[PDB]
Amino acid sequence: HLGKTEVFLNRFALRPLNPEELRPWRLEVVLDPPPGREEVYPLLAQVARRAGGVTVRMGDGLASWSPPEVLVLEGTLARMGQTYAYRLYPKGRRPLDPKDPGERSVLSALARRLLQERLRRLEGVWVEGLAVYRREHARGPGWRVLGGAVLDLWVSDSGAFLLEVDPAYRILCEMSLEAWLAQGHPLPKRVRNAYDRRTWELLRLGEEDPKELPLPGGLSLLDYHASKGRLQGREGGRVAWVADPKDPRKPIPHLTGLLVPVLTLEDLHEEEGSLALSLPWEERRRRTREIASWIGRRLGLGTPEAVRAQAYRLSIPKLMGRRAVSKPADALRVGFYRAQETALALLRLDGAQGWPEFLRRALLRAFGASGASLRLHTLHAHPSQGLAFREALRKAKEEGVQAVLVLTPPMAWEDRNRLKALLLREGLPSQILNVPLREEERHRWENALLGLLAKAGLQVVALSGAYPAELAVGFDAGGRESFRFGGAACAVGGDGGHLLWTLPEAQAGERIPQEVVWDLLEETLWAFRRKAGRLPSRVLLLRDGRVPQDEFALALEALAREGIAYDLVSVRKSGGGRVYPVQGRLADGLYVPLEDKTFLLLTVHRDFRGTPRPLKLVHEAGDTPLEALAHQIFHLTRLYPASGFAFPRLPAPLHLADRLVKEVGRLGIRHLKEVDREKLFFV
DNA sequence: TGAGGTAGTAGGTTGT
DNA sequence: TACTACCTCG
DNA sequence: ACAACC
Ligand SMILES: Cc1cn([C@H]2C[C@H](O)[C@@H](COP(=O)(O)O)O2)c(=O)[nH]c1=O
Ligand SMILES: [Mg+2]
Ligand SMILES: [Mg+2]
């Protein structure tokens, strides 16, 4: 490292727990009927809530900061239709030691419920769970935006309250769908009932009368809702054709008077105005302090003391094209890290002629600097020819074309997806560049160029340094359906001079089956074997999010058997809180060790962006020092080739894995058979 | 579809 | 998880 | 149901 510094977390030390709070009441829970296996925990949480006071689940029972006599000790629960009778039996009170982890966990849950409960009786603040919104940040015709904070409250091992505070905004609609449309506002993309929290997707807006509309049951829309007594205080307006978010293939009648639009930033782009909800970190730190003080004051918890942590500045990563670069885009001028002779094709959908002179010039320039030969083909064919177009594609692929650039006006989602999938089935990855295009838009088309090159299989940049792991692979799950795709991507070589993806697998949920984890890993090992002519001495395993229990067990045992060292790191995009400099400036490359095997990592930060959200990492397995892992992950973040001016927050293999399973989730996996693993089709 | 993150808005999974 | 808006271009 | 993540 090149310097240890000091930072604030967005945490605050408050008053010590009083001697009553350290000795909570213990209660035994008795349910009739006794719940089933899968009901016990939700029922325990529910009874902890029905009890009242400040009580939480403790093991099979309850812990409370309220004595039992001021609790609702007897009552009834409803759960999925079934009714349960409950009674709570006082079992004395037992001291909890903050020095001990589990007991501290109980004290912390109690603290959280404390925060919730005291927030509940504030006036007149908009409270939503653990969020509190005081000020009004912005208003408008039928809409307003509130400003406040998301909060949390737990217990330190020294026995004091720790308050986490992070400024937050909240968008609220005040008028119904009918009233909303009565202001010249366009149709919102989403909407919810007024009687419950269920939401819909708003499509058309029919003109059929609600008192003469055949509802799948006999009665009409209008008196169907009137029977439920929904439009008594309300008033049904027009007919709105909504659709289920999980079943959009079945339009449904509804009443504009019984709907309330759910407002997003693209429902307020009309007003434009300003609505910048990102905060400069100085302002966010200020708001954090102010809010922390307010909360500590109104809740009788004392004056906040901003907590401090020792941070370490990490070595600057050394990015390489043919020469050293500061950004991946500079490889276009200097040359790529590695380049074979390549053949790119051009597909024009704007009816215009061949290659734009400046794109051609830039490509020739970059390949000249790389000392590699270039072939610019032009696709003289159009998708509206039908299968003949596919024939054209096949001929292009046979002549050595590796990827094609598609110049087109903005395409609709479906047409974009369909075109890319089609090109994929003929083994051709595609880069789209939108066709109102001027040479002055160099960021857009240099990035398009970079993506194009990554898709042809080139490595535009690489890292220079000594790293513990010679192979780094990321795992993620993606897809917007009942099922998901679990996928892996990798950087092979200490330099990261080879980026590969592997064929994903369909899976029920977020957890990736052990066999699948291993198989993807074996594919990446095989990539390494094929490039280096040996097995890697050490691999860095990067999981997006939490690592489900034993998910990597089989793969880790397999690695052990082959004599390959490993590190498993959980990389969490949220839950890391915030970090602020005690000193002057806030820079990235920041490494903040907290617990053992778990640390924070500020990978990316631009001042014109808001406040950075540091990654939270847990070293789940392996014996590599935290500092080395942080070092390599931080540098790997700089290895991504398809973003020429801004580095991703995630290490390249995870970013890649993510875009891979996202794209497979969109297009489907059926198109990927003839696409080379070296070609990053999904960037 | 230019890319990135920070913001927001919906939704989900894992697991006690 | 995945969407859009904002702003700018290590 | 809630948790700490996606
Ligand atoms: C009763 C009924 C309602 N609906 C639609 C119209 C209602 O506005 C919408 C919402 O009803 P709900 O929220 O009470 O479940 O369901 C049908 O499509 N068919 C039916 O048979
Ligand atoms: Mg994920
Ligand atoms: Mg792309």
Side-chain angles (χ1 to χ4, degrees), chain A residues 1-37 39-138 140-188 190-210 212-226 228-234 236-245 248 251-269 271 273 275-479 481-584 586-683:
Chain A
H1 72 79
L2 43 95
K4 59 198 292 277
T5 177
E6 210 183 25
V7 293
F8 299 117
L9 311 175
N10 59 327
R11 301 176 185 179
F12 296 89
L14 295 173
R15 72 163 170 85
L17 271 59
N18 64 48
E20 300 296 343
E21 288 160 337
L22 296 169
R23 298 181 60 237
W25 283 272
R26 172 166 29 92
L27 297 103
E28 170 186 0
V29 182
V30 172
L31 295 167
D32 176 24
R37 177 87 158 190
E39 316 279 32
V40 50
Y41 287 116
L43 245 30
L44 257 28
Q46 190 171 328
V47 81
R49 270 235 157 267
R50 288 281 278 96
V54 180
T55 101
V56 302
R57 191 182 61 76
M58 187 171 67
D60 294 328
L62 296 184
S64 186
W65 278 344
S66 296
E69 298 79 6
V70 289
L71 291 183
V72 193
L73 298 186
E74 300 185 14
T76 47
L77 305 161
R79 174 73 179 173
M80 292 176 173
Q82 176 152 245
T83 303
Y84 302 78
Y86 85 83
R87 175 167 171 181
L88 309 181
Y89 291 82
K91 280 306 183 295
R93 51 197 304 191
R94 43 117 42 167
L96 272 13
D97 188 8
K99 287 305 175 188
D100 194 281
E103 304 187 348
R104 188 196 315 115
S105 182
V106 177
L107 295 170
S108 286
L110 286 167
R112 159 113 60 172
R113 186 65 68 85
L114 182 295
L115 175 57
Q116 297 181 17
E117 285 307 288
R118 302 207 180 180
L119 286 187
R120 282 194 56 191
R121 52 172 56 220
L122 288 179
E123 286 176 335
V125 177
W126 194 278
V127 178
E128 190 179 7
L130 284 167
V132 279
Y133 307 91
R134 339 162 166 183
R135 278 84 181 182
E136 168 180 295
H137 180 259
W143 63 265
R144 62 169 173 163
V145 170
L146 304 189
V150 182
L151 302 178
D152 191 15
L153 222 218
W154 62 91
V155 181
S156 74
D157 53 24
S158 61
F161 283 111
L162 281 171
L163 205 222
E164 184 170 349
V165 182
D166 194 23
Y169 291 97
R170 187 76 241 260
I171 304 183
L172 293 180
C173 190
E174 307 179 10
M175 52 171 54
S176 69
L177 199 270
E178 238 303 284
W180 182 258
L181 271 296
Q183 234 75 3
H185 284 137
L187 297 185
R190 208 178 292 99
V191 75
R192 82 153 47 88
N193 304 323
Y195 42 90
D196 48 35
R197 309 309 314 279
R198 290 154 62 221
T199 69
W200 313 83
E201 169 176 339
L202 177 64
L203 290 176
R204 285 210 58 183
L205 197 58
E207 58 178 8
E208 35 274 43
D209 198 274
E212 206 73 27
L213 201 58
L215 266 283
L219 23 63
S220 178
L221 233 192
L222 189 58
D223 47 334
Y224 159 68
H225 285 284
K228 296 281 225 308
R230 291 171 174 174
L231 51 94
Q232 29 193 16
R234 252 86 166 87
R238 271 163 293 175
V239 156
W241 291 100
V242 306
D244 183 28
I252 289 187
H254 214 300
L255 299 182
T256 54
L258 298 173
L259 293 174
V260 172
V262 189
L263 299 182
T264 64
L265 284 180
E266 70 157 335
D267 302 331
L268 303 186
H269 180 28
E271 356 279 296
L275 267 221
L277 293 181
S278 290
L279 291 185
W281 65 266
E282 300 88 345
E283 184 177 352
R284 181 176 290 273
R285 178 179 61 172
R286 183 180 54 87
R287 278 260 61 188
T288 303
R289 288 187 292 229
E290 300 180 350
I291 289 181
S293 66
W294 166 267
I295 287 297
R297 180 170 59 249
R298 284 293 273 107
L299 271 51
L301 296 177
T303 66
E305 313 294 322
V307 323
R308 284 184 280 264
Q310 202 62 30
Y312 297 84
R313 211 151 304 185
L314 290 173
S315 77
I316 298 88
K318 306 187 178 185
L319 242 195
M320 257 188 73
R322 190 187 179 87
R323 314 199 268 101
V325 295
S326 59
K327 47 170 152 49
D330 290 332
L332 286 171
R333 358 206 182 275
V334 153
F336 312 130
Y337 181 78
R338 186 190 61 248
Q340 74 155 227
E341 75 151 26
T342 69
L344 282 4
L346 175 62
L347 180 57
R348 287 270 219 168
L349 294 189
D350 55 336
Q353 314 319 117
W355 288 86
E357 190 53 41
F358 62 98
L359 294 187
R360 179 178 206 99
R361 216 189 306 128
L363 284 180
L364 255 352
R365 179 181 298 124
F367 275 85
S370 302
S373 195
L374 181 58
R375 284 158 44 201
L376 299 189
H377 300 248
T378 300
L379 249 353
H380 301 299
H382 199 274
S384 47
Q385 294 175 281
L387 302 179
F389 178 64
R390 227 249 223 207
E391 178 73 14
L393 290 176
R394 185 201 49 85
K395 281 198 183 72
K397 186 63 204 308
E398 288 204 11
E399 283 180 21
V401 175
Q402 293 173 313
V404 347
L405 172 67
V406 173
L407 290 178
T408 168
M411 316 179 62
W413 267 106
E414 295 178 11
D415 296 325
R416 173 261 177 194
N417 288 345
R418 198 226 57 157
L419 183 67
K420 294 184 90 74
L422 173 56
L423 294 233
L424 250 8
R425 294 198 298 277
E426 208 58 52
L428 291 171
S430 62
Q431 172 68 48
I432 290 179
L433 188 51
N434 281 340
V435 97
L437 177 67
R438 353 197 81 82
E439 184 176 345
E440 18 280 350
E441 304 179 90
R442 85 173 306 103
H443 297 103
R444 200 174 106 227
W445 62 256
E446 279 191 349
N447 268 1
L449 247 44
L450 289 175
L452 204 227
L453 294 165
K455 287 169 182 170
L458 290 190
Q459 259 285 64
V460 330
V461 293
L463 286 168
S464 181
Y467 298 102
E470 218 176 3
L471 175 68
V473 23
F475 301 83
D476 195 14
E481 307 257 344
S482 46
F483 62 94
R484 299 180 170 181
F485 287 96
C490 64
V492 357
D495 58 342
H498 280 105
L499 298 176
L500 287 293
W501 59 272
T502 56
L503 236 212
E505 187 57 69
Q507 58 184 41
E510 163 71 17
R511 169 186 282 274
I512 306 171
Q514 304 195 45
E515 329 93 57
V516 180
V517 176
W518 166 243
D519 289 347
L520 300 188
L521 183 57
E522 180 187 289
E523 210 57 39
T524 66
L525 295 177
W526 208 239
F528 192 99
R529 185 260 93 131
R530 285 189 285 101
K531 294 312 162 59
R534 65 188 164 84
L535 296 183
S537 58
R538 185 169 217 108
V539 298
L540 172 59
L541 278 14
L542 302 174
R543 173 79 223 242
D544 186 79
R546 298 181 67 89
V547 176
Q549 264 295 296
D550 300 319
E551 178 175 77
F552 275 71
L554 183 73
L556 255 31
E557 235 301 283
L559 283 182
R561 288 167 179 177
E562 289 292 339
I564 303 180
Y566 58 79
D567 287 275
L568 209 203
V569 179
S570 166
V571 180
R572 308 173 188 185
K573 301 179 293 300
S574 66
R578 307 291 197 155
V579 294
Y580 300 101
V582 171
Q583 62 290 5
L586 179 63
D588 52 16
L590 226 35
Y591 159 67
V592 191
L594 304 173
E595 203 184 308
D596 238 342
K597 305 296 189 171
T598 127
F599 62 95
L600 302 174
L601 192 65
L602 215 187
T603 51
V604 293
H605 167 46
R606 307 278 76 193
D607 238 77
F608 71 93
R609 292 202 213 120
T611 309
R613 321 205 72 256
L615 300 174
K616 176 187 179 184
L617 294 83
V618 180
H619 190 205
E620 229 78 48
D623 51 30
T624 296
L626 285 313
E627 187 164 60
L629 298 171
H631 181 251
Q632 178 156 24
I633 291 172
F634 171 54
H635 285 201
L636 276 176
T637 234
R638 238 114 285 208
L639 208 248
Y640 193 69
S643 181
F645 307 92
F647 306 115
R649 184 167 60 128
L650 289 172
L654 271 189
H655 194 70
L656 284 164
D658 173 76
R659 278 183 157 261
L660 163 71
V661 293
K662 205 183 303 294
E663 261 288 82
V664 165
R666 283 198 281 261
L667 315 184
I669 202 175
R670 65 191 175 277
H671 317 286
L672 298 188
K673 203 176 190 303
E674 271 77 36
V675 193
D676 299 334
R677 296 178 177 85
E678 218 192 19
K679 297 180 184 176
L680 312 183
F681 69 92
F682 49 83
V683 299

